[PDB]
Design a protein around this ligand. Structure first.
Ligand code: HEM
Ligand SMILES: [Xe]
Ligand SMILES: [Xe]
Ligand SMILES: [Xe]
Ligand SMILES: [Xe]
Ligand SMILES: [Xe]
Ligand SMILES: [Xe]
Ligand SMILES: [Xe]
Ligand SMILES: [Xe]
Length: 148
């Protein structure tokens, strides 16, 4: 099925410059859910305002990490069974870190916003609903980290 090629096609534009695009992603996220900010604790300090995050090298490395894990999920768009065991542990990591299950709908909304603003004309509704089901599956797997 070329639902998996809508994704691969949309991703190649984005994956051209991942840090620029993942910066869009996290600016949108904090605009939607300001209380996600304090969970990025590096040397036990809390950023005051969203813009403080953009000067932090650790924060920017975490962006590069987000974009590599999305890249991996793309690279396995049919058989996301490979990544399950990893995504589960990635979930549990984020549970320890303080992330709550409800914050996934926000991360999802931010991913779509970033895709939408990046592809403009090409973000067609089949593309949206593709990313939307992929993301839903990435989410099911990550959720095992909260205990099934
Ligand atoms: C939703 C808000 C998020 C918050 C608040 C958050 C916060 C954190 C924190 C505090 C860490 C540990 C310190 C660090 O490695 O930089 C971390 C690690 C990580 N995050 Fe996130 N994160 C979020 C979302 C995500 C998403 C969506 C992905 C991937 C799609 C992601 C991928 C990772 C990866 C790969 C690591 C490294 C984990 C390890 O191997 O130890 N994070 N995150
Ligand atoms: Xe940001
Ligand atoms: Xe920001
Ligand atoms: Xe890293
Ligand atoms: Xe990256
Ligand atoms: Xe990437
Ligand atoms: Xe997350
Ligand atoms: Xe994501
Ligand atoms: Xe994803």
């Amino acid at each position: 099925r070329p639902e998996s090629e809508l994704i691969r096609q949309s991703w190649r534009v984005v994956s051209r410059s991942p840090l620029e695009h993942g910066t869009v992603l996290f600016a949108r996220l904090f605009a939607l859910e300001p209380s996600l900010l304090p969970l990025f604790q590096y040397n036990g300090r809390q950023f005051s305002s969203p813009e403080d995050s953009l000067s932090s090298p650790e924060f920017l490395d975490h962006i590069r990490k987000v974009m590599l894990v999305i890249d991996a999920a793309v690279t396995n768009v049919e058989d996301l069974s490979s990544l399950e065991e990893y995504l589960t542990s990635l979930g549990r990591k984020h549970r320890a870190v303080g992330v709550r299950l409800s914050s996934f709908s926000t991360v999802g909304e931010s991913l779509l916003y970033m895709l939408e603003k990046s592809l403009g004309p090409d973000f067609t509704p089949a593309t949206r609903t593709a990313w939307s089901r992929l993301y839903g599956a990435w989410v099911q797997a990550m959720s095992r980290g909260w205990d099934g």
